[PDB]
Amino acid sequence: TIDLADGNYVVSRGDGWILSRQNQILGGSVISNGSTGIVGDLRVNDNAIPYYYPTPSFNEEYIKNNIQTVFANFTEANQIPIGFEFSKTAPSNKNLYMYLQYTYIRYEIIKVLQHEIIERAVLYVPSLGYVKSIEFNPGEKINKDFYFLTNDKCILEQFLYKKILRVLPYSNGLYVINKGDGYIRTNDKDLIGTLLIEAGSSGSIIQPRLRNTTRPLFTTSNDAKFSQQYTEERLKDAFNVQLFNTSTSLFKFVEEAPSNKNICIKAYNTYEKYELIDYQNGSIVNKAEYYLPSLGYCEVTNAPSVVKTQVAEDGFIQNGPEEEIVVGVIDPSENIQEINTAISDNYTYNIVNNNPFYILFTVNTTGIY
Amino acid sequence: TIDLADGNYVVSRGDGWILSRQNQILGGSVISNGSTGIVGDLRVNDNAIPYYYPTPSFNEEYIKNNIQTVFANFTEANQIPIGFEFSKTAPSNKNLYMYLQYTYIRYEIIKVLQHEIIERAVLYVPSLGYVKSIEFNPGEKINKDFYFLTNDKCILNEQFLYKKILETQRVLPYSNGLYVINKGDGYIRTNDKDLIGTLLIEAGSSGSIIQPRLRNTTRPLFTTSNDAKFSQQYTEERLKDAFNVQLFNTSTSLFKFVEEAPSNKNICIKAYNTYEKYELIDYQNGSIVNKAEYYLPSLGYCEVTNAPSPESEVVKTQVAEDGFIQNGPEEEIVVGVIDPSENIQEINTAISDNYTYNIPGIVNNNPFYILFTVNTTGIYKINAQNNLPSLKIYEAIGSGNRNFQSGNLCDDDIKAINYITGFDSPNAKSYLVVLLNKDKNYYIRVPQTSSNIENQIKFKREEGDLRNLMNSSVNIIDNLNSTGAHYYTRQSPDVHDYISYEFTIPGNFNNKDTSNIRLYTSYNQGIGTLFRVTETIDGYNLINIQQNLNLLNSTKSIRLLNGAIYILKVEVTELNNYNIKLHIDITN
Amino acid sequence: IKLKKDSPVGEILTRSKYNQNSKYINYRDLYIGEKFIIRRKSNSQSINDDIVRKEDYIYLDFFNLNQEWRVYTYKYFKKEEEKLFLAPISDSDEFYNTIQIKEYDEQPTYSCQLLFKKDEESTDEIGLIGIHRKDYFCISKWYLKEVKRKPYNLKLGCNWQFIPKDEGWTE
Amino acid sequence: MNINDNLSINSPVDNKNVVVVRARKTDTVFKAFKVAPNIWVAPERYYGESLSIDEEYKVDGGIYDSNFLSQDSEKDKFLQAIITLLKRINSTNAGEKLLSLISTAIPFPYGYIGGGYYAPNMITFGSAPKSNKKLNSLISSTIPFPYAGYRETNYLSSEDNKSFYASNIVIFGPGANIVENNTVFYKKEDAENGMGTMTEIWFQPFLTYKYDEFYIDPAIELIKCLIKSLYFLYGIKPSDDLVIPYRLRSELENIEYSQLNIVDLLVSGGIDPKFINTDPYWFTDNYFSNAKKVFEDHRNIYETQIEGNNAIGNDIKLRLKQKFRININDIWELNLNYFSKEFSIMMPDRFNNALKHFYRKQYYKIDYPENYSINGFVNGQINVQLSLSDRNQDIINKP
């Protein structure tokens, strides 16, 4: 039962989905009085295998392609190991048992006929983990619902559906503009993960850079002049960016929930926006945008006490501060001559053939020339 | 000088044995002005080799074999790299120097003659590390005892565990079938066979024992009372069916234990490997006819202890028997599984208001399962040809959450089943009245049949008053054609579960001759309700007659009509016997 | 072929071999699999004669446990390679039971062919029993075209032989 | 396996499927197009051989021309031809299996920088902030320090020597001699010691020749080159001195023999291998025993050490598994006869390695989307209409 037009729909129901009958298949930890137990994992290879539950008319390839095109791409994102961990401190005279699960992302491909769903396939992407902890006494009876889960449920509840079908006083030249470092993509396309930290516990997400491969994003309005190599060369000329698709700087986010209520921490992958503009007579005749993989973004939220929301259009949201650094660069198409002697008091340079060009020089003494 | 009988003995002297002259071989660090310094190591392979000191009678193979037989298997345990680290913040402005050394387990094998030790061999197994720190000033002389150790010594409890060398109930209301029971987490072995290691933290310091999962190899344990059918592969398959356990001898899940000692006394942390216990039981006729135990490697267990007073003599204590100790919480989760020896049929079309299923010839009079789904949530009456045989109904746990195709059946291949109702007596006459949800896969178990006549299983969507007997198995009584007393024994359901008996009173219908009917039970206590039953074209119209009865040794009778067809519904509120026994005393 | 425990379709299994004590002698066991029997269709010939002749309609049964089961095929199917139906002796209006045994190789051979026909008086022809690739024991309508080629193919999947228990073959 | 058919010589260099790498450690670079996992095509001629050889060094029966594969149109035609041949091979089950084995048979990686395939070191990062009662200095995350540090040897290095792309096979163009398919290793020591090495193939897909009453399918020549490359990938390469007597030179007045390397005999198929691969073997060398022992050693090294390591990637750990799934006898008993039978391709069957002495070859040009196709030669191997190449006049004849 749904309120939508007839046809096929790609739906994301968020992450933090724990499956049924497989809660403590990974095992747990018993912590005696005083000590701290840290239970973690590093999603890289085999636990990073999606689970397909397809139907007739929705094969694996169909659902996979649709979910990559609309929502976040997992085939390339699963090659990069992402680590998560929980820390729990046991009481001074008590024993604490904590066990780890896997939280996935529930993706669906529904077929709406009339105002009811007649078909539904599911695709589970391994997102992160979840530690459930209890404080127990020897011989104490524990509720059976603490360990076992009869049916799947979300521990974080969304339904995102998509129907399948100012004056610039700059001289004429080439400019590179660093426009900020907070940029994430819409529709949670850059979601590293989300952890639900219980009260009195600590959670952590680390990008350990075990595989130093990053994916920048390039857009352009003229591939003839502003190409990948051209924009990379201009960035290296302006800000001396030496690494583009490989970063060895690794980042971690740690959050300690208070003893009153739980908390949720969402880690995203960010970008740095580098515009490259060709300014000519007060008008940007060519603009190429580059997005350099940055060191992530952290969000803290609390679970609310649903509404079928249409997916958002493609774009970027900046969560960093307002930045605008403008650096002019030398046009590579114009020749550059040099004067190998400092200008002292009086110089005449004799002039390439009717072509604009640069002259590089220096003065022997500070002064007005 | 010992107080044991003559022979050979395997002795463990505990953890925390620091060797002589080996101090300051890994190095040390200098900090000052309240600066925190961390030092750690990794016991992987090369710095994790044993030291053998044999004797002509006790060769290396002999001591190694005996030690690994009685105590922890150090050969297979040193293959897994285990990390540790210490942290010690500096005090106010005085330089502090710390240095790291190894600790060992000392394994002596001795030859006791008379009551004097005449022979001994030593085995040193590298366990963990130990950090010793001092506060110094530039140009200050330090005692030689701090730096250089002349003789081997123990920095932990003075253990002495010796073992002589020898020259060689409860009522379960479960239905018949295979069950997998998670019996809890935190199972360690006796005699420290699972001890990752002990770590001693000085006052004002912190220590951590870490499993970094640099190697995924883990060692599960398996015991079985019948290897012919309950093998390790079979138990692994059943565990995968029940709890979806994917990895058995491989694990990638880091666990780390960190302890900060108070700044008045030292502390010790013992890290163990734990196990999750799974019992695969074959349960028939109210008794465990087969049992296998599978211990899956868990994520360890940390124990915090205080250093004992040095003014205490050693006590030669014998080792404990081979067994397991549970340190985690009390847990017992029972999940029934489908017997793999029985074929499973399928009904692709969802069951409508009416459906009849003919038993195929490929079964050839064998117990089997049929998998079916129902188009609309409702109460269904499921029976067979003249209510023979008595058939059971299950419910796949977690079915319908993932896949969906309206009007069809999606085989989710879920082998974990939850028993709903039914009987295990093939000669009994009964039909199930159950409640089926719109998007759940259900199993019907047809038992062993001893007849060549083809059968038809009928599912009838009941919308009348039969909703009263929700999730029950109406048991037909037909051999009631005389006076006296009758007893009927059935598989008693669990607490808050329903059973039913449809019976008829001997004699013709004359609206008179109200025979005295006394319905009671023998062991189990249950709330009983009686109904009168009126058969129409659309079904049954339950008519309430008595409610809130007490069947356990009931001594009350009812002046009840003759020739009529009544239904007695029993909700067991106290389970005392595996088999329920309904007694009906009829008198004129 | 071996009868499957659950599915009513014979599964294809690799034959055993001899690796007991001698590397100088190698062979494969032939007394493995289901014991097949052949029965008459109409009992119209002479009782004294009991040999199987070419182009003969018969029932091909096999002994399962302590019973005899016949092999049938569906009336209608889409794919050329259709699996068989292994069931106890029964009468149905939706399965074909009569098998015509024939010989197609002009040159001398010990291999025979099994064809499925709608009726003894019906020109309708269903297919030929064979094995097609996971190997699967099925019937194919593609064998009909390939069996009439002038150069006969002796390595086809339709060539079947029957091995009785002989006093000259041990193990 | 799925051949990437959406590539062309005009595609931009995206550093993922179209790259510009350096040829060995020389001063020359070349473009490369990845058409399958660890399978690349270089549509230009080979770089090692000079295209203008002295006349005194040209081999008999070889078309020498230093202008072939020089324009972009010819390079694109070569690339499309290689794509078509690979797709034709992939169509059949045996060809798909061979291509999958080629893709998954990476050379055995080396150990860590200090030696060994066991677990690596450990490093703790990210100490938690100090709390009000606890220092929390040891509350950090432990990670393997040299993660996936096994130093693979099968890679192409970019022109800047900063980007590296994994690759097993590079299909170049023909070298100095136009009609000469060749298979050359990347490192002899790593090719003869059971480790493994990169392989480069010089292929000429545009010229074929007629034998008896049929034309030679270039797909079978490519298959032979791939099978020979499998020898280098697994490191089972016998010494160049392991030869067998192939033919007796009856045309000469002295008793001389022409000999063939055992690799060529084992790969070329035909009838000659049937006279050596006999049960029992009459011809045996220490090479087979050494190769089996080294392969078993490497398989044990993987199974006991490189298998349980949880700090290396499944991109290598799981290809090494599939590479070591097969046995050496599978490679040795794999020749052109099996692919000829499974493809129904007629090929020379007697002394196919000495066809230069027996008769003179006439070369026919192949237009690929005109004559060849996904199913092979149009109108079969016999009734295909192929025009005689104009280069037949340039065949150098040295008796």
Automatic annotation (TrEMBL), chain A:
GO terms for cellular component: extracellular region. The keyword Electron transport does not apply. Keywords: Plasmid. It comes from the Bacteria. This is Hemagglutinin component HA70. The gene is ha70.
UniProtKB/TrEMBL annotation, chain B:
Pfam families: Clenterotox, HA70_C. GO terms for cellular component: extracellular region. Keywords: Plasmid. Residues 455-588 form the Hemagglutinin component HA-70 C-terminal domain. InterPro entries: Clenterotox, HA70_C. This is Hemagglutinin component HA70. The gene is ha70.
TrEMBL record, chain D:
GO terms for cellular component: extracellular region. GO terms for biological process: proteolysis. The keyword Hydrolase applies. Residues 2-326 form the Botulinum/Tetanus toxin catalytic chain domain. GO terms for molecular function: metalloendopeptidase activity; zinc ion binding. It comes from the Bacteria. The keyword Repressor does not apply. Keywords: Hydrolase, Neurotoxin, Plasmid, Toxin, Virulence. Belongs to the botulism non-toxic nonhemagglutinin family. This is Botulinum neurotoxin type B1, nontoxic-nonhemagglutinin component, NTNH. The gene is ntnH.
